[PDB]
């Protein structure tokens, strides 16, 4: 049990590997609006883990999805959003780190 929320923009996407979803049941992926869910799933052959992946339609929704999930680890590069200086929402979330530090967990 090692709970991680992973938010992938277009750019963050190269730090992904089909391997992660195979191996960690408590990993949960949140796609930016820029990333289509169904194309993402065939591009990494992760159809089996449809449910673990969450298609969001606005950037704001990301934070609600993170806050609803409340994962122990929260990986997200805020710098890759189009929104900025809206850190209006907070630290409700345990252990945010920039998405680059995937490999640590």
């Amino acid at each position: 049990g090692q709970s991680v929320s992973l938010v992938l923009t277009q750019k963050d996407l190269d730090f992904f590997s089909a391997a992660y979803l195979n191996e960690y049941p408590n990993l949960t992926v949140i796609l930016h609006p820029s990333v289509d869910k169904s194309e993402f799933l065939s591009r990494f052959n992760v159809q089996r883990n449809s449910h673990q992946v969450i298609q969001v339609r606005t950037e704001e929704s990301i934070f609600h999805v993170l806050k609803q999930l409340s994962s122990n680890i929260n990986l997200i590069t805020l710098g890759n959003l189009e929104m900025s200086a809206n850190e209006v929402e907070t630290f409700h979330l345990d252990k945010f780190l920039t998405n680059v530090h995937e490999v640590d967990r």
């Binding site: 049990g1 449910h51 298609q55 339609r57 606005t58 609600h64 609803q68």
Partner: protein
Amino acid sequence: ASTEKRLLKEYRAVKKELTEKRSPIHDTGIVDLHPLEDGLFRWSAVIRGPDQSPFEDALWKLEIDIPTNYPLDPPKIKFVVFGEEKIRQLQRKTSSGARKVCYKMPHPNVNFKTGEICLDILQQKWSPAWTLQSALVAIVVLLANPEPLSPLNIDMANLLKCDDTTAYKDLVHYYIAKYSAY
């Protein structure tokens, strides 16, 4: 004094309505409803979330506390919701006996932790006109018809305020997959 025999009548009613195949009970979402133990004042119910909605095709469990002056006062009704560690142990008993039930409830008008529900019918639009059975049907209607402006779960409600209907639905599909059990 009297309450007891109403409650007993409500039980017999629903008992026999579920025994009939063609009765309208089934399309209302009510899978099961009964008292616990010998005590009439605590009940269990199982409901099926309504079609054309993100809660479709999954069951939920409800616990129902009946006050003594019922039906003048409403029952207290909550979804049974467990911690992620309690659910993963329940999942270890996988022999596919009775039915799969989901033990998380992600909806704007239910409290994610407690299982508590925010529905007018239960909070003093209640009247003795209502029964346990129709209050349940009311809750399934609520599942299809969340009210974002009266939220007990802010984050699910805010997905609707954003109009992020797909995030709402993916997330509901998530919880059902990962957190059901027997």
